[PDB]
Amino acid sequence: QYSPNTQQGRTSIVHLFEWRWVDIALECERYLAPKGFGGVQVSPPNENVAIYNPFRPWWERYQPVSYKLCTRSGNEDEFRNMVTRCNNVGVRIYVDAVINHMCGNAVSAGTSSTCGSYFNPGSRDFPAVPYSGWDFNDGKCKTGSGDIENYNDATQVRDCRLTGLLDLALEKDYVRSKIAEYMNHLIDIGVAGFRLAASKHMWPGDIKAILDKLHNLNSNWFPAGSKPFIYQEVIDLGGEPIKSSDYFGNGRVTEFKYGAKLGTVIRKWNGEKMSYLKNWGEGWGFVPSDRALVFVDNHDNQRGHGAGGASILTFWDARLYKMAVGFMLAHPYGFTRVMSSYRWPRQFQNGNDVNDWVGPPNNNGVIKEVTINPDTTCGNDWVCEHRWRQIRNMVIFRNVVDGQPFTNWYDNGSNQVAFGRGNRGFIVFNNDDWSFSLTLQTGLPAGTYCDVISGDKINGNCTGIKIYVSDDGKAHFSISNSAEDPFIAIHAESKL
Template identity: 75%
Template sequence: GFCWGQYNPNTLAKRTSIVHLFEWRWADIALECERYLAPNGFGGVQVSPPNENIIITNPNRPWWERYQPISYKLCTRSGNEDEFRDMVTRCNNVGVRIYVDAVVNHMCGAAGGSGTHSTCGSYFNAGNRDFPAVPYSGWDFNDGKCKSGSGEIENYGDIYQVRDCRLVSLLDLALEKDYVRSKVAEYMNHLIDIGVAGFRIDAAKHMWPGDMRAFLDKLKDLNTKWFPEGTKPFIYQEVIDLGGEPIKGSEYFGNGRVTEFKYGAKLGTVIRKWDGEKMAYLKNWGEGWGFVPSDRALVFVDNHDNQRGHGNSDGSIKPVTINEDTTCGNDWVCEHRWRQIKNMVIFRNVVDGEPFSNWWDNGSNQVAFGRGNKGFIIFNNDDWNMSVYLQTGLPAGTYCDVISGQKENNKCTGKQVYVSGDGMANFQINTDAEDPFIAIHVDAKL
């Protein structure tokens, strides 16, 4: 049915990962789609908020100023509307989708002042709740609805405060008003017309699910230049639900997928062996750990909230340069270009749709599993060397490990793994290995 479209990322077939190119310029993302992301099987890019934001100078131009909207005009440090359109067109033309980080819960901070210190130069007056470039006025905010003493969220145990009061002083939009819902939808529909494939909804926990449903119901289908007729935008909602609060990610399933922050948090705990955790316990990873169901989850290990942006002394964004060795220069860190990450993006594409199979563990921190007859991965996170003979489920042959190297010109640049006619293979991983894991798949077979 058409009503389930908001859960589908609208990526090309056999493309299963989204890379967040946080704070990149639109011109650099367009280039990266063409020269790297498309050839390596990336499904799409999550971009930083493209709408006009406040300019903050104390501290000097922090990354989080982009989470303080002034209007829905498309001009930011990442570029103007023409550059944004060019990026979306060029990325779509090579089969890489664009997902917009939509900041629609709030405008700028209450102490944002008045003037034209905004990335398009639009006038605003935060004290008067006046944003004429939208336009929003005092009537369009939740100040009267909030029941906390300060007007801020003081108690996360009170769902009314979380949704109706100001998140870290950010002016909270009154999304129960049809006018506000229409302005939000108008902004998102403008982006759909340009060709985006979907949205990350920022601060979804701070909006009532029904108010979100109301503006999402106003969205158009995706642009038929790149998407089949009747395709709905992909929706994934930022809901930080680590347990211990009354608001649950499940309240938002009707609107689309939900970010599963427990995924990275728990995985980090296991890999570090904290709290008595061990990798053997990962056998029922996912729903078995109380996570959001697979068909409603958007998962990640790391995200921008625990990293930081970059910039020049003049507050502009540095271009992304590419070094001879394919890493990024100009102080940018491009994890998606690290061999191990890029090759596991490809691994995930190759095994897409295959069943979880051939699990093995040593009762501690050595584990292995396959995905049907397409791929197999094994880890040694114990403090002793490992040598095991395991069923991989793979066809017989010689495979290149895609962690220590890859298949190039019909040779392996890293380790080789021999799988015998019965699917068995020997794996040796010593504790001094640069990366104590090995991954093989059918597209890396000699």
């Protein structure tokens, strides 16, 4: 299940949040493939409720109306075209599957959907699937409000409505079959796996029953017997009766403790320091590496909207964000996901962003295209973190050192640390309030290496800092606490 199904030496996927199918298709060909990215997580491709108040928020896409591939990202033809073109260039597609529920029970009946499908939440009617009152958990939930009221009761967390979202009766074979019908359509089109949204709100056993109905990956692109990659969104920060380990039999799980703790450490909250990262991973109480999908931030918590709270690092905190992403991509733990966002007008009031609902860049509701500037950055308010030199080069760094052990660790007892990956790579960080100048053992072969954070290797030369490694593997590193990017990374492929 726990294999990404990515090509040979590609080790990361990027979340192109709210991107249109046509733009992702181009991106696969012009950037992702040549830069070594393993795949793309796309937003829910199935029809959702069109919410006008507020005006087309990002979260309207987590309120299904049917399973027709018709959204603001494009129609079914465009979706198929994207999967085909991306697959032909070796870049996988993973879809965000919303199968725990349909839309809000208080939503008005009518055809206010992204494809015009009629639906009536009030009478539990979704004819486009079709689903009726018999397919929901209204009679199974025991809370007085019908919604989830207390997370200390594992039963209502699964059988009741997540903040009013109509809850599907996943134990019924009919419902499980309608879900598999949807997912098998996607698999046969060519998708490589799925992100199961709101997995905590589904019984591990019901999920398994559904997965048992799924086909193997399309044999025109994947080896026979390939199973779809599955990563379940389970927010488990401890303290709840439900644990992410209960879902290991179905596939990997999102490790939300990862970004939450990395954030507090890099921000140096509660006296935490980078030197403590020496035993980062399972030692910190995280799930086993082979069951983890990791990330610094996700579409939900980058807007204070999810697990992690105020500690989560995002593109808004550029300097520290690049370091966190850098550390994540260099460290062997888990399978990594890079975030790619869009800017929205943040407006805090009493510590809360009142514009956290704002959807993707648009013209009267029509999502804007991703424009590429001559410096390779994006326009139309798309942030494109995956294109920042410091992040893109670390994505490549991870590919280069794949399989190499964690070694040659160093720390100053504070926030100046370094470590290597076998004899293929080495990275150094300075998060202290003073300069760093020291000769360290890198485990790398003698030679002149280009630092891939401050620059690039361009045929025989480096555009940024250059590092000289001696015969014994030692090299001198100098990082000022005033550096634009307070960290240096060099690897086998950046050697001159």
